[PDB]
């Protein structure tokens, strides 16, 4: 077990974390975090039998609401929390049958970091697209990414493009036709 298994094997759960209004202008690559969030949302719709979409909101009333730029799937499980780690009672039971987790959002050193560490304690295989991850400061971000990259072999940091291709082992995959449509989309900020 070194890469994401084919989408048919086990269950994967996507996790859009704290992509809220208050952070939109305070992060540089926020737009690329929104792009990846949509990329995974459309992917989720293509294979909804094996995938789940979870959206987290941190202290909503006080400077926080999921950015309208992201069109969430109709089967999206949106919860609201005050704990920095996105592991709350509500999502804990939602991952009782899920073997994999795609955590993407903000902040790399804060919410993301404590979420993935908790997910690693639950024996879950976490896969993080650097593509859709950010922070307000570069030093705070860098130090967090270098750390999670040493949490192998159950934690891996790649890109949104690679992740999609990992789940579809073959190009003659029945769903590839629909998946390849997503890879052609151009992210706001060049990669």
Number of residues that bind a second copy (CB under 8 A): 44
Residue 79 interacting with a second copy (CB under 8 A)? no
For every residue of 61-78, DSSP letters joined together read TTT--B-TTS---TTEEE
Q: Which of 149, 181, 185, 188 binds a second copy (CB under 8 A)?
A: 149
Please tell me whether residue 170 binds a second copy under the rule CB under 8 A. yes
Choose the binding region for a second copy from 8-16, 20-28, 69-77, 82-90 (rule: CB under 8 A).
82-90
Does residue 157 belong to the site contacting a second copy (CB under 8 A)?
yes
Of residues 34 through 53, those in contact with a second copy by CB under 8 A are: none
Smallest gap, in angstroms, from Cβ of residue 139 to a second copy? 4
User: Could you say which of 25, 123, 139, 174 contacts a second copy (CB under 8 A)?
Assistant: 139
Q: How far is CA 98 from CA 108, 123, 124, in A?
A: 23, 10, 8
Q: Is 93 in the site for a second copy (CB under 8 A)?
A: no
Report how far residue 145's alpha carbon sits from residue 142's, in angstroms, rounded to the nearest whole number.
5
The reply on whether position 121 binds a second copy by CB under 8 A is: yes
Distance CA(1)–CA(171), nearest Å, equals 21
Are 179 and 40 in contact by the 8 Å Cβ rule? The answer is no
Helix (H, G, I), strand (E, B) or coil at 37: helix
């Amino acid at each position: 077990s070194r890469l994401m298994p084919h989408y048919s094997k086990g269950k994967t759960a996507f996790l859009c974390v704290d992509l809220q209004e208050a952070f939109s202008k305070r992060i540089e690559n926020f737009a690329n975090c929104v792009f990846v969030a949509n990329r995974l949302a459309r992917l989720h719709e293509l294979v909804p039998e094996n995938t789940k979409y979870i959206v987290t909101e941190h202290y909503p009333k006080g400077l926080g609401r999921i950015v309208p730029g992201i069109t969430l799937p109709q089967t999206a499980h949106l919860i609201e929390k005050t704990r920095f780690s996105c592991i709350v009672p509500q999502v804990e039971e939602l991952l009782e049958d899920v073997d994999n987790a795609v955590v993407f959002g903000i902040e790399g050193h804060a919410c993301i970091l404590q979420t993935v560490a908790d997910l690693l304690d639950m024996n879950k295989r976490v896969f993080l697209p650097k593509d859709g991850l950010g922070s307000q400061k570069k030093t705070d971000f860098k130090a967090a990414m270098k750390l999670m990259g040493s949490w192998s072999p159950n934690c891996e940091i790649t890109t949104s493009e690679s992740i999609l291709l990992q789940m579809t082992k073959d190009a003659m995959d029945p769903n590839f036709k629909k998946i390849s449509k997503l890879l052609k989309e151009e992210p706001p900020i060049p990669l």
